[PDB]
Amino acid sequence: CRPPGQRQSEWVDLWEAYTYQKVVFIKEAITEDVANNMIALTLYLDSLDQKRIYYWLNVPGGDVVPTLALYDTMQYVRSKTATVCYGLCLGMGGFLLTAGGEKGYRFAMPHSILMMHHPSGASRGQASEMHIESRELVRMRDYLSLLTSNATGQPYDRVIRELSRNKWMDPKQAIEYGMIDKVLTTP
Amino acid sequence: SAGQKGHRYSFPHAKISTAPPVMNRVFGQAVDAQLQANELDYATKYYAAILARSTGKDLETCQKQYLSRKRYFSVKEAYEEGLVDKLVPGFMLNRFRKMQK
Amino acid sequence: PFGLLLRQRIVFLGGEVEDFGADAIISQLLLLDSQDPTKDIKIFINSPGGSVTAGMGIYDAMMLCRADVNTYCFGLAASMGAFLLGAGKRGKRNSMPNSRIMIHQPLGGASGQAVDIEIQAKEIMYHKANLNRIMADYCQQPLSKIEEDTDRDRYMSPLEAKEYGLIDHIIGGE
Amino acid sequence: PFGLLLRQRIVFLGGEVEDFGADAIISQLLLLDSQDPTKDIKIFINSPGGSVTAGMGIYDAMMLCRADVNTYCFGLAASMGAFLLGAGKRGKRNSMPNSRIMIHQPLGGASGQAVDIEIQAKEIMYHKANLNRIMADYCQQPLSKIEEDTDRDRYMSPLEAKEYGLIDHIIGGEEAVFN
Amino acid sequence: RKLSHLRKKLWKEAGPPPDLATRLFSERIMYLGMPIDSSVAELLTAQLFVLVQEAPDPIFFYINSTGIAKSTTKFGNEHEAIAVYSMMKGVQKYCPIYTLCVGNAFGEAALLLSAGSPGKRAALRSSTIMLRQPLQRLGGMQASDIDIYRKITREKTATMAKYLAACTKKTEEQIMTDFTRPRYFNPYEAVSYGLIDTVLEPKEERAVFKDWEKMGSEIADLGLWDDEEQPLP
Amino acid sequence: SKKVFMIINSFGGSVGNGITVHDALQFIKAGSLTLALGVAASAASLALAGGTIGERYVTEGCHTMIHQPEGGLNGQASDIWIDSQEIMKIRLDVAEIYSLSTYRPRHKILRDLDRDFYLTAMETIYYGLADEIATNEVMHSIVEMTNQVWSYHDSKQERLLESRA
Amino acid sequence: KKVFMIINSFGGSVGNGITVHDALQFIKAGSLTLALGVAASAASLALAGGTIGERYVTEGCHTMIHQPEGGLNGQASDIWIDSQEIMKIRLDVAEIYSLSTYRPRHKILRDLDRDFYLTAMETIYYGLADEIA
Amino acid sequence: PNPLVIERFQGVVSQLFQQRIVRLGGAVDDDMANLLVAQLLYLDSVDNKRDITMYVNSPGGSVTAGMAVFDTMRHIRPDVSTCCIGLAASMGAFILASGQAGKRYSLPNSRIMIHQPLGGAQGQATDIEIQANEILHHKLTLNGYLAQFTGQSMETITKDTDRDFFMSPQEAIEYGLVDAIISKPQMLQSREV
Amino acid sequence: VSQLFQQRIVRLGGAVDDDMANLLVAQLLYLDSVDNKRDITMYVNSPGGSVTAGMAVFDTMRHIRPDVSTCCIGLAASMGAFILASGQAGKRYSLPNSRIMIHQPLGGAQGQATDIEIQANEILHHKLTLNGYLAQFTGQSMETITKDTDRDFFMSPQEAIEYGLVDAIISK
């Protein structure tokens, strides 16, 4: 993706050519620095026009706090969204597949590797502040399960028992579980 | 000191130091330390030739005054020695500007 | 050195309380009660702290023996030797007039899943409620004031430690 | 070994002078003085340097010894062993005919506060002033001449060390000394 | 007028330049995404000198950071958060400032959250506000300077609670009560605390509560020895 | 016009870098305004006093600090005396600039350089390092002062964009 | 119109080879895959993912065929879940090769047991390429 | 580490070796497991009728090293009385549970942790499923012997030892880990009325 | 170094920390137990150390029912010189070319902003404890001890007798 392309008459980079074409690409992991460029890109396309936004994900994992920064910007904007999967979305990247586009706008390749698990954290020090960060990690665990239950239609008691352990999905089981909407064909 | 005479500008609170130069890590024989001694011999002879043209001294005077030990120079006594001549052009104190007002 | 006084039941809790360091204290504690259960065992305290489960291993091993226990504090005892200073019986808890008594709550550790954080959270919540029951026994203090004293770090002089109930006597009188 | 020379009252000062190696020589020097205050003590100095704080304790230990001391310089004597070489009794100072003698000031690093720098700056100058006035007693040399020879970082052959006053006798009849 | 410069710079010097920070700068949107350091605070001040000049039009301010430093990394100084606070405090009568909390706000990021205009401060649905106790845990140097470091840590907590009470309209002793422990704050109850003015809600609410999980289990019998199986839902 | 507006924010740095930015603001023909924000270290307090007297402002959140010259020294016994005397020359240098600019005698300032001590905004005006307290009211005058000096260059910028179009 | 790319890879994970596999069938037009030098397991998936009849190979090129590799460490339960992950990924890439080589699937798992290398001759016989350039 | 404490530690374990007291040293790995099985196979020379006191204190370790200590404790002729002081890990509590029935003593201040054993897997694709099967084989054998020692069902062990499960000996005496507690009778205190 | 233990000589060498202070008081428990009449001579050579480690060996020397003797070897920097001044009056000896340095002890403050102010009060309590005990050993006023302990001040052994650090010197 290092050679650039063209928009209509001049040379523009490949990721920025799809930015004018309202296509967002995410290829690296979700960290604090790349999430600052994604939520600033969602507000920039929302101010120009009001159309459907496309997100292509290749996230192999990431942190919990910058992922929730990108999730809350999907519901704040007045435009529509559509998440399309190619490659793999592991960890918190699979949660962003079920962020928006619930009414038939979740596409995936037939060989996409899906992954759903409970989030994690690490903070040590005093024993009194360990109780406060445990309440923060508990309040982040059930809230992340409540959004997956409303988007996929699954019961809330099944997400706590299944996603606490290791769970992996193929696109054949992603249809019956309500995680994706349609499967992309050859054309 | 190698600039044009009469226009050596300087800040009034700077530090000037003239010391003989040193050499890096060289691992050799007895004749290898002799040729490295000749490189520093030409270093003191070339540096004193610049100071003799600037300050107006002899060749052996600049080696005894400047290039012997690691010493330092202020701004005020360097004008009497011959390193600098004046300050920077347009220099004026902010307290001296308040005295004019 | 240390071996010249080990035959007269002299225990030195020197250095940081680790898994191997505290085990050397426990293994020599069972030797002294098995040879003579009627005479007292003296334990010296000079330690800047240590582990939570390792430092707890000295207290319950000293309660396992049926003989008498004397405890002396040298220098600084930071939340592991200070808990072990008052662990002896009443009347034979002496302290030096310049020794520092540090009261502090223990630490914890967790690395894995978020459900593994709350397991270690209630594991250290049980250890915090365990030592507050123990420290209120030999001090005759209520549970309300002994929980806030372990909240912040407080270096205590032995002048106020006598009325607090942690120590019993002061060697030298002044 | 080293214990065979200890019962014959001969100690060794080898390696770099440290604080742990300083008191090991002082503790065995007072044991020989308490056993026999009449028998001489022979020392052997081979040191490439050391601290000025721990090196003065070896000099005060030989001054505390009531019996006479004998010195022997083999190998190296760099800035600390040359001070302990001449510090013995006059007339009983021998060495190897090819050993090197280095008379130079000690080193030191300074860091910290601005008031902290000027304290240790005059402290190492007071150590430089005390080491010059002590070494000028047994050498029979003036103070102005001995304070500038220690500034030059050049070694000294034992041929010119004899008339300098630092050493008295050379083992070998004074013909094996090579320039 | 500068609105013709806005249409000309986006054609030449902002559009074909592919940097997103330049195109966000032209739309009067100033976003703090990086952790605050010596390079961030001078960049935030230099952007504020330009925005107050061309127009009295309102400026959008987005806050998404972990503050100056995380608790599991190297710590610095906390004085740069006041420098961007007092710089933007005088703008409020010259230019309206809109402040919205996206993502998270750890420590000093909540101080700039209350630094907005009244009636314009806002937060999202799943935001997090942390009243952390800052900073500078390193004190291993000479003991002659720790007594004036006790004066520094006392007066910095005084002026931080003074600036927080000037915006939240609360008592200064209540700010030090929240500084003893790292208490997290829900944005739904932060409107009653005085940190934010309102909470902007999405168009379609799909965040179901968890209060219906309590099915009302009956009390067990007194003559039943219950097992010690751990609570795992 | 020709006014120079500098902002002051530095928590550390070398002492020699603060004296260079001091005389860099002295030889300017026009006036200079210095605004202190956050802190003022040994490199930053000399930049604060380098401005024109009457335009120096310190906020309530800013804390002026006077620090001794920190240096690294390594060498022989002959070289350790010559550079430690330079520390006495720098301590004579920073006490001289603090004396000529704050209306204070040299003896009372030299009794303050032996120990590090932080200053507040009220002690900045009392010693003489600044002139006025940068409150919220006088900060509005700094906004309107930098608006006229920037629009004097932006009026030429407005004529170049209209000529190109 | 027709995409033309150079295939050259000696290492890398096979999970990235599945990303470039499905991207080639997403193009409506044909694809020209020309392998040069080394073709690893991630590179052979893009070589077999091209259109049948336009997969070129040189005389000195080789194709590396091997099973996926991974690194597993942690609790006892998620090793068993991730053990089925590497097994069905190896069963997934066997079905990827089976759509081009027209061979039974049980013989490809025997070649996927160890490292398998092919020269320019038997690459045409095994169906990974079409002809020699 | 300090080398001075090593000869003092070697002296106190040898004096307790004459009183038939063994020690579990740190994490259970290969170097101590050959040393520990040398100690249980030497105490039978004095007498094979009296019990063997076993000091149990282990913060973790490997899997196969603790299994080499487990089989020799139940095979020798005298009974092995385990004693857990401090902290027992998943392999440490299995050694404590492998003692004689009715002779497993402890103190009520220890912590008992039981879980599935830690492990890893590295290699090719078929190497992963091979090394995952022996961990599940070690999962079945550790949970199978604990169901016979404590007397619980098969489903009870796998659902409690799935994660970190810390217990006290006041509640471990109800499950079946510790048979009895060792504590001196205390004098009754004059409580408030 | 085992020949000094039979001659009632203990060695204070290097910086004082927790394992050295446990070993130093262990030699003091044995030398008074074999004889409660003969003195114990200690060779102090330390460049500093911890706050509580030097205070752990200070109090146990006061419990020795015969007097002790302290001899300076080389240098004592702000922690060993406190052990010299705590000896018996008339038994404080020093080398004629040794060095005595009096300074406040080192120590850090790591933790919360509420934690670093409550632990600096202990350092301020340690400064009142060190200077409060040193003023009673030297016979000087309270102001002159708190005036020179902030910066490092080296003292010659000739001027240490008139100030009150040592009692005599061993010249012979």
CA E59, CA F144: separation in Å to the nearest integer?
A: 18
CA D115, CA F88: separation in Å to the nearest integer?
A: 10
Contact D64 I172 (CB under 8 A): yes
The b/e string for I86-103 (b: 16+ C-beta within 10 A; e otherwise) is bbeeebbbbbebbbbbbb
Nearest Cα residue to E81 out of F37, D145, C2, C36 = F37
Report yes or no: E1 and E30 within 8 Å, Cβ to Cβ.
Answer: no
Nearest Cα residue to A123 out of C116, C127, C109 = C109
Residue H188: CB atoms within 10 Å:
6
Structure tokens at F60: 């309530």
Enumerate neighbours of G (3 or more CB pairs within 8 A). Answer: A, H
Sequence-distant (6+) residues with CB within 8 A of H129 are: G83, G84, G86, G87
Determination method here? cryo-EM
Backbone angles phi, psi at E79, to 5 degrees: -80, -15
Report yes or no: I166 and I92 within 8 Å, Cβ to Cβ.
Answer: yes
Which runs of E-coded beta strand occur in chain F? Answer: 4-8, 32-36, 39-40, 56-59, 63-66, 73-75, 117-118, 132-134
Residues of E in contact with I114 (CB under 8 A): 133, 180
CA D61, CA I73: separation in Å to the nearest integer?
A: 9
Contact G70 H128 (CB under 8 A): yes
User: Which among C14, C152, C153 is the nearest to I18, CB-wise?
Assistant: C14
Chains F and B touch (3+ CB pairs under 8 A): yes
The b/e string for E197-227 (b: 16+ C-beta within 10 A; e otherwise) is bebeeeeeeeeeeeeeeeeeeeeeeeeeeee
- Signed CA dihedral, I80, I84, I87, I92: sign only: positive
Nearest Cα residue to D116 out of I152, F64, C112, A34 = I152
Could you tell me which chain H residue has the CA closest to the CA of C58? H86
Residue C54, Ramachandran bin (φ over 0: left; ψ between -120 and 50: alpha; else beta): alpha
CA D168, CA D151: separation in Å to the nearest integer?
A: 23
Report yes or no: C117 and A134 within 8 Å, Cβ to Cβ.
Answer: yes
- Chain G residues at the A interface, defined by Cβ less than 8 Å, are 15-16, 18-19, 21-23, 25-26, 28, 77-78, 81-82, 84-85, 88-89, 92
State the burial class of residue A156 (Cβ atoms within 10 Å of its Cβ: 0-12, 13-18, 19+).
middle
- Signed CA dihedral, F126, F129, F135, F137: sign only: positive
- Is the minimum CB–CB distance between I123 and chain E shorter than 8 Å? yes
CA distances from A92 to A58, A62, A70, A71, F69 (A): 11, 6, 11, 10, 51
Which runs of E-coded beta strand occur in I14-158? Answer: 41-46, 69-77, 92-94, 99-102, 153-155
Backbone angles phi, psi at I56, to 5 degrees: -80, -20
CA H77, CA H123: separation in Å to the nearest integer?
A: 43
User: Which among F38, F60, F140 is the nearest to E79, CB-wise?
Assistant: F38
- Is the minimum CB–CB distance between F161 and chain D shorter than 8 Å? no
Q: Does residue A140 sit in helix, strand or coil? A: helix
Domain boundaries, chain A: 1-187
Could you tell me which chain A residue has the CA closest to the CA of G27? A187
Mutate to test the interface with A, among G20, G21, G26, G99 (most CBs of A within 10 A): G26
CA G65, CA G62: separation in Å to the nearest integer?
A: 10
State the burial class of residue A9 (Cβ atoms within 10 Å of its Cβ: 0-12, 13-18, 19+).
exposed
Residue E63 pairs in a beta bridge with E32, E101
Domains and CATH numbers, chain C: 6-170 (3.90.226.10)
Active site residue D79: yes
- Is the minimum CB–CB distance between D115 and chain F shorter than 8 Å? yes
Task: Give E166-189 as a DSSP string.
Answer: HHH---HHHHHHTTTTT-EE-TTT
Three-class SS of H94-156: HHHHCCCCCCCEECCCCEEECCCCCEEEEECHHHHHHHHHHHHHHHHHHHHHHHHHHCCCHHH
Q: Does residue F134 sit in helix, strand or coil? A: strand
CA E191, CA C15: separation in Å to the nearest integer?
A: 52
Contact E230 H175 (CB under 8 A): no
Structure tokens at E13: 């010097």
Nearest Cα residue to C106 out of C54, C145, C155 = C54
CA E151, CA C132: separation in Å to the nearest integer?
A: 34
Contact F53 B93 (CB under 8 A): no
CA D25, CA D35: separation in Å to the nearest integer?
A: 16
- Signed CA dihedral, F39, F43, F47, F53: sign only: positive
Domains and CATH numbers, chain E: 2-199 (3.90.226.10)
Look up tokens 């000028």; give the residue. Answer: D136
Query: Residue H177 sits in which domain range?
Result: 1-193
Nearest Cα residue to C80 out of C103, C98, C109 = C103
CA distances from E26 to D43, F160, H104, I84 (A): 84, 19, 76, 73
Could you tell me which chain D residue has the CA closest to the CA of I172? D64
Domains contained in chain I, number: 1
Structure tokens at C47: 């330690």
Nearest Cα residue to G37 out of G6, G8, G4, G66 = G8
Could you tell me which chain A residue has the CA closest to the CA of G88? A170
Nearest Cα residue to A9 out of E72, C56, E11, E32 = E11
Residue E31 pairs in a beta bridge with E62
CA E49, CA H21: separation in Å to the nearest integer?
A: 78
Sequence-distant (6+) residues with CB within 8 A of A26 are: A34, A38, A55, A56, A57, A58, A59
Instruction: Characterize the bridge pairing of strands A11-12 and A5-6.
Output: antiparallel
Which runs of E-coded beta strand occur in chain A? Answer: 5-6, 11-12, 23-26, 53-57, 81-85, 88-89, 106-108, 113-116, 167-169, 182-183
Residue H46: CB atoms within 10 Å:
9
CA D58, CA D41: separation in Å to the nearest integer?
A: 14
Largest CA distance in chain H: 72
Give the residue before each break in chain E, using a C-to-N cut-off of over 2.5 angstroms; say none if it is continuous.
none
Chains C and H touch (3+ CB pairs under 8 A): yes
CA B38, CA B48: separation in Å to the nearest integer?
A: 15
Nearest Cα residue to I154 out of D19, D23, D130, D122 = D122
DSSP state of D17: B
Contact C60 H111 (CB under 8 A): no
